[PDB]
Amino acid sequence: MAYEKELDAAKKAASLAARLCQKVQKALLQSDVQSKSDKSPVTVADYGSQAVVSLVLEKELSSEPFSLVAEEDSGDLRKDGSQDTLERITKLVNDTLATEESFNGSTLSTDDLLRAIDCGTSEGGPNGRHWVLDPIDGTKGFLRGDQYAVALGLLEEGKVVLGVLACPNLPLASIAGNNKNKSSSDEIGCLFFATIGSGTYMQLLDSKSSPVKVQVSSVENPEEASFFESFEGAHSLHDLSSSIANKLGVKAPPVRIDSQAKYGALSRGDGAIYLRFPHKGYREKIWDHVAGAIVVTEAGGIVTDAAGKPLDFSKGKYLDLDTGIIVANEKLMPLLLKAVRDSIAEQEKASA
Numbered sequence: 001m002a003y004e005k006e007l008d009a010a011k012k013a014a015s016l017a018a019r020l021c022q023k024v025q026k027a028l029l030q031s032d033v034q035s036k037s038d039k040s041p042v043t044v045a046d047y048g049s050q051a052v053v054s055l056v057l058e059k060e061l062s063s064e065p066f067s068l069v070a071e072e073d074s075g076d077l078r079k080d081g082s083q084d085t086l087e088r089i090t091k092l093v094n095d096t097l098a099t100e101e102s103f104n105g106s107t108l109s110t111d112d113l114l115r116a117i118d119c120g121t122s123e124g125g126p127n128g129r130h131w132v133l134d135p136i137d138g139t140k141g142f143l144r145g146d147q148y149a150v151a152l153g154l155l156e157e158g159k160v161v162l163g164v165l166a167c168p169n170l171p172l173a174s175i176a177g178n179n180k181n182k183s184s185s186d187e188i189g190c191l192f193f194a195t196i197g198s199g200t201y202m203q204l205l206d207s208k209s210s211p212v213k214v215q216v217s218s219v220e221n222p223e224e225a226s227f228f229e230s231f232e233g234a235h236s237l238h239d240l241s242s243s244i245a246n247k248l249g250v251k252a253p254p255v256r257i258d259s260q261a262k263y264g265a266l267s268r269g270d271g272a273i274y275l276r277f278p279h280k281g282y283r284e285k286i287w288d289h290v291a292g293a294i295v296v297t298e299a300g301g302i303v304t305d306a307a308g309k310p311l312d313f314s315k316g317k318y319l320d321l322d323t324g325i326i327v328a329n330e331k332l333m334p335l336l337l338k339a340v341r342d343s344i345a346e347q348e349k350a351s352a
């Protein structure tokens, strides 16, 4: 694979972040109440995921200065007697970063933990090499035990060259194909990774099982195409997705995932089409799409905006794009593009 050394570091880092997150989610009292605590689990998982990712990549890739594009800093872990959360993350990170055989006698302190979060303060851009991390995508899914993911990408001169997706709750089999109705399968927890010109692979998380190459759906007719939707999201400019699907005449049931693991499922061929249209004023962040984009691309998928333009990750943290994001295979994308821009020119522009 291209960027083989970076790919190994990123798969190790993302997998360890998934262990830290699973250790929190399984510790959610195992009851629906969760001790009635605050967003403490979500915050310690986010800060903890970002911490272990930063600490692994920095140790594994000692050949280059570390540059990470992340949403959060350490400003919250300093005001108030927040050591209740600061020290619980430090104990949480050290415990997870104990099966490493590289840190060993290290046991990072509370000050070392917040330095790991503040050392990842990059702004992307068209120059240099930057890691792009979402420590937990699908915060609501993480709480309800649903689908969440750790997204880790790499930019090289403003272009995405590597994506890694860790989906601890995603099963290995097709979630869209509920027709299986099999047993518990017990094979749950996927790892998607791809680098430029090298293909997309799927592996069992924390398992020495061989990775398998994955491809997108070979669906030819829009009627049997399947759409990805949100587990809770109702509106979100559905009127576009509806009229687009109406002109396409889609009759297959939708697939409902509530995290960035939507990309991993589409790249293995569970669904055929994904359409995201952000609300007015909301600017899409690069850590929400960079890792999933190349995972889909390197599996044969087409990831463009509304105008058919490729997504450009060189402009910083935000992604200026036409309307939303359009994902499909080579055969469905041309018709899908016409269905979108018509629905954009129709019901949308018909307001005037």
Ligand SMILES: [Mg+2]
Binding pocket: 134, 136, 137, 138, 288
């Ligand atoms: Mg996010």
